Amino acid sequence: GSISFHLPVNSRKCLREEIHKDLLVTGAYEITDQSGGAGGLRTHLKITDSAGHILYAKEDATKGKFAFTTEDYDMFEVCFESKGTGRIPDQLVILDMKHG
């Protein structure tokens, strides 16, 4: 799966998946910020399961990869959240995922 979206400053966007198999999920992401860090901008990446356990987290996310396995209820959420001050152009996020 491939996702491209804009992420405005001080917003959160998430992909939620409810599948019913235990399998391997792999992802690759790139956050592009045309402002080069204006207004103290930073972006957090957090992946959680149905019970809120953190499967992956990246505090100051830029570009990277992740992988996790689905367990119990096999529901997960991948969330990007930005924080910054003032007016900042939207960031662009690209997220590519594979289910094994």
Curated annotation (Swiss-Prot):
Ubiquitous. Residues 3-100 are annotated as: Required for interaction with STX17. Residues 3-100 are lumenal. It is found in: Endoplasmic reticulum membrane; Endoplasmic reticulum-Golgi intermediate compartment membrane; Golgi apparatus membrane; Golgi apparatus, cis-Golgi network membrane. Disulfide bonds: none annotated. The GOLD domain is required for proper p24 heterooligomeric complex formation and efficient transport of GPI-anchored proteins. The lumenal domain mediates localization to the plasma membrane by partially overriding the ER retention by the cytoplasmic domain. Ectopic expression of TMED10 alone does not result in its proper cis-Golgi network localization. Interaction of TMED10 with TMED2 is both necessary and sufficient for transport of the couple to the cis-Golgi network, and TMED3 and/or TMED9 contribute to facilitating the process. Belongs to the EMP24/GP25L family. Cargo receptor involved in protein vesicular trafficking and quality control in the endoplasmic reticulum (ER) and Golgi. The p24 protein family is a group of transmembrane proteins that bind coat protein complex I/COPI and coat protein complex II/COPII involved in vesicular trafficking between the membranes. Acts at the lumenal side for incorporation of secretory cargo molecules into transport vesicles and involved in vesicle coat formation at the cytoplasmic side. Predominantly dimeric and to a lesser extent monomeric in the ER. Monomer and dimer in ERGIC and cis-Golgi network. Forms homooligomer (via GOLD domain); the assembly is promoted by direct binding with leaderless cargos and may form a protein channel that facilitates cargo entry into the ERGIC. Forms heterooligomeric complexes with other members of the p24 family such as TMED2, TMED7 and TMED9. This is Transmembrane emp24 domain-containing protein 10. The chain holds residues 32 to 129 of 219 of the full protein.
